[PDB]
Amino acid sequence: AAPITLWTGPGPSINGFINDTPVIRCFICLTRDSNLVTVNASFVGEGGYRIVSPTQSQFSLIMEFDQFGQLMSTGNINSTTTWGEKPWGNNTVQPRPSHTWKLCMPNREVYSTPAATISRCGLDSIAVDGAPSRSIDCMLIINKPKGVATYTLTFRFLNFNRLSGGTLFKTDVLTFTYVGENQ
Amino acid sequence: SPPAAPITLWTGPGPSINGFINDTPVIRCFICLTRDSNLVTVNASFVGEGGYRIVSPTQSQFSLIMEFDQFGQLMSTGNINSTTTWGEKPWGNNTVQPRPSHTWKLCMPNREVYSTPAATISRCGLDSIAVDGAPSRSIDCMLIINKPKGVATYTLTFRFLNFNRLSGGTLFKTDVLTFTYVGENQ
Amino acid sequence: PAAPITLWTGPGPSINGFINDTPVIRCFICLTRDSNLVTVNASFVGEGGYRIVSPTQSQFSLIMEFDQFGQLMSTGNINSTTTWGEKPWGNNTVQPRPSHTWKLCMPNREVYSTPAATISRCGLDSIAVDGAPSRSIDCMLIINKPKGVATYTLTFRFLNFNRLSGGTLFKTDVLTFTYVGENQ
Ligand SMILES: CC(=O)N[C@H]1[C@H]([C@H](O)[C@H](O)CO)O[C@@](O[C@@H]2[C@@H](O)[C@H](O)O[C@H](CO)[C@@H]2O)(C(=O)O)C[C@@H]1O
Ligand SMILES: CC(=O)N[C@H]1[C@H]([C@H](O)[C@H](O)CO)O[C@@](O)(C(=O)O)C[C@@H]1O
Ligand SMILES: CC(=O)N[C@H]1[C@H]([C@H](O)[C@H](O)CO)O[C@@](O)(C(=O)O)C[C@@H]1O
């Protein structure tokens, strides 16, 4: 029994794709400790998504994993960009899969039907000094079916119409938690 | 051996209708308390049944209180209690091991840190996938830590509040809720 | 192989949050590093002029400054002039002897090479007011916003007091934040 972290590494490329177009830089870290997995994530919109307006359409960024906890090539965030294990003691991304990667996955029996957590997602919070009307929502959906994925994690960005105006799509550090899979 | 110290107490998956109000089973409560090195993470979700299947904006607030004794044993007298499934989750499987160990105390909220009651009030989305996170489909859930109840040494209270935020009748199918507190010393 | 460590103020902190060299807030701060992430667990109680806060309250930051070894410096709003050190597993003491392990509680400098933030709800007097929606402010954690010669900073910035419906005891909820911990 050991902890394990899967992540994008620091300074991720534009690795969030909508219609195969790179539009969002996603820092994603999945850390499994004894029983629970902590999702630690942040996002920076690029190009057409650098600035979001109150009329921005909602969207999902879905990660698809196989039965062994390996990130598949077909999600919005996928294995074509940097993804792998974080060794304790350095900031590298180790791409070679281990059986242990399954421990970062959402427990299939606990999440046998889809689960969700919708939380505030502050945008550009330092520069707008946390103005209430500069937050959207980001909902994590756990194990909503997608393709032939065994596990899915979806980051769904919602309620842009709560924004008072155009806002730089520079998210806060977001945290979610779920029960990890058994080896 | 820091790896020797973590412990998880939980209901197991697919809990029964194990949340009681006035001795009537009304809510299915998935509760997981995971102690790692120092902090305990509460991971919880709830599904209303019977008259609590759907909640309206005029719904009265309520507490689901878990009472624990000084050894971290869930007592039989709370709204969520030891008459239903509760015990340790072994690393590597989804069983519930009901035989109390002294290690169970490590999942409790530290008596000195929480020598007077503490709280965290947070958003509690209802039916979030089906309503696509509509802002007016959230209530609040407040975790109260060590508010006295009877002779419990520790208490954890899930208090559901601010149903008047809801735009209408909503399925009482909560998000996965997370809270954190300082764990008790062995 | 992971090595957990907790740095904290201990329970019942003194008035250890200073604004303009005046002690105004009792700050309970716990930084707990497990395998990869640090969990910030904190709560605050105002004293004197900050005992009660009103909708007209000006925003403020409580900054913790740490050096390259993860040792709390003397120059932040929360600083090494008050109780701060390691929490031993099994008791509630505060051990002041610095170790190479203290760096593990710091925000990873490569991950947070520019400042990061998390703005979250901060309920005030929540049990007494029964969680009334108009009794919350916000608390934003800012990670590694530059200050002085600190290598790492953690800033608790209290904001949006105008969300309050009136004078409210500045007795915060238990607040939690998470960030990627520094490498040994
Ligand atoms: C209640 C109060 O004094 N509020 C002040 C606030 C505090 O004095 C301070 O945050 C305590 O640490 O200070 C404010 O102004 C800041 C400046 O003093 C600082 O030089 O630069 C800061 C930005 O980096 C900021 O402008 C504040 O925190 O906003 C002003 C506020 O009224
Ligand atoms: C900006 C945008 O394209 N939004 C559209 C999204 C995205 O294409 C996908 O979520 C990306 O994965 O798809 C929708 O079905 C949705 O999720 O509600 C409709 C929405 O208008
Ligand atoms: C739906 C309901 O019954 N609400 C009532 C609750 C519950 O009976 C208990 O919280 C269950 O433990 O009790 C109250 O005293 C309370 O907590 O404010 C009054 C409230 O009207």
Residue numbers in the entry:
A (entry chain A): 360 to 542
B (entry chain B): 357 to 542
C (entry chain D): 359 to 542
Show sentences the authors wrote.
To date, all Ads display a characteristic, icosahedral symmetry in which 240 subunits of the trimeric hexon protein form the facets and 12 copies of the penton, comprising the pentameric penton base protein and the externally projecting trimeric fiber, form the vertices. At least in vitro and for most cell types, the fiber mediates the initial attachment to primary receptors, such as the D1 domain of the coxsackievirus and adenovirus receptor (CAR), sialic acids, CD46, and others (for review see Zhang & Bergelson). Our results showing that the CAV-2 fiber head contains a sialic acid binding site creates a paradox: both HAd37 and CAV-2 fiber heads contain CAR and sialic acid binding sites - but HAd37 uses sialic acid and CD46, while CAV-2 uses CAR (CAV-2 does not use CD46 to infect cells, unpublished data) to infect cells. We show by structural analysis that the CAV-2 fiber head also contains a sialic acid binding site, but in contrast to HAd37 this site is modestly involved in hemagglutination.
The crystal diffracted to 1.9 Å and the structure was solved by molecular replacement using our model of CAV-2 fiber head (crystallographic details are summarized in Table S1). The electron density maps showed clear density for six N-acetyl neuraminic acid (Neu5AC) moieties in the asymmetric unit, three per fiber head trimer. We found that the sialic acid binding site on CAV-2 head is distinct, both in sequence and location, from that found on the HAd37 fiber head. On the CAV-2 fibers head, sialic acid binds further away from the three-fold symmetry axis at the periphery of the trimer. The residues involved in binding (Asn435, Ser419, Ser416, Gln417 and Arg515) do not align with those involved in sialic acid-binding by HAd37 fiber head. All seven interactions between CAV-2 fiber head and sialic acid are hydrogen bonds or salt bridges, suggesting a relatively strong interaction compared to HAd37. Unlike HAd37 fiber head, no hydrophobic contacts contribute to sialic acid binding. Finally, sialic acid binds within a basic patch in each head.
